[PDB]
Design a protein around this ligand. Structure first.
Ligand code: VJB
Length: 170
């Protein structure tokens, strides 16, 4: 009838985790800190014919090694690993987030998608083939997004749902 999916968004400060969440759930964007994140946690949508409830867990505001972040990683069925294409440090941080999920889950088979956000901005510092190479070594897809123009937003979240379905189907 309906299927629920627990999706967790991780990544460094200001990469756009919350803006991506609000765009998906509310079809809304503002170029400032957006307090409507407090009301943006579930989207009901049909994906490939199936009525799906997407519950989005946003790690924004959590310390790097907090107990609530650990709970988020235990609960999540799939993870968006977000960096910003104009922030080199946020791309270098991706290894840490991947390792933290793998250790908390005690598994090497966790559904994940690598997301390069802020693709609408000029003067990038992270090149696509750098991210494509990383995603290949993880065995996961890579998707370029903009929370502002909505580029790739449905692609990123629905691709993660499809990865979860493949995992559940053995
Ligand atoms: C964030 C650090 C900083 O000082 N930025 C300078 C502006 C400060 C106020 N503006 C702001 O915080 O904007 C948000 C968001 O609107 C913007 N953002 C997010 N995604 C995109 C995008 O795809 N394209 C463009 N042009 N802007 C985008 O970045 C900041 C932070 O976004 P967030 O979701 O709050 O970040 P977090 O990962 O949840 O911490």
């Amino acid at each position: 009838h309906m299927t629920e999916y627990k999706l967790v968004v991780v990544g460094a400060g200001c990469v756009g985790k919350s803006a991506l969440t609000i765009q998906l759930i509310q079809n809304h964007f503002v170029d400032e800190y957006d307090p409507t994140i407090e009301d943006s946690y579930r989207k009901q949508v049909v994906i490939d014919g199936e009525t799906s409830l997407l519950d989005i867990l946003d790690t924004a505001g959590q310390e790097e090694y907090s107990a609530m972040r650990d709970q988020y990683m235990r609960t999540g069925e799939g993870f968006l690993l977000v960096f910003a294409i104009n922030n080199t440090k946020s791309f270098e941080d991706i290894h840490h987030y991947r390792e933290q999920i793998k250790r908390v889950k005690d598994s090497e088979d966790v559904p994940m998608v690598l997301v390069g956000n802020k693709s609408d901005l000029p003067s990038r510092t992270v090149d696509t083939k750098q991210a494509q190479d990383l995603a290949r070594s993880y065995g996961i897809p890579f998707i370029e997004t903009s929370a502002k123009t909505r580029q790739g937003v449905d692609d990123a979240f629905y691709t993660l749902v499809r990865e979860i379905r493949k995992h559940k189907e053995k």
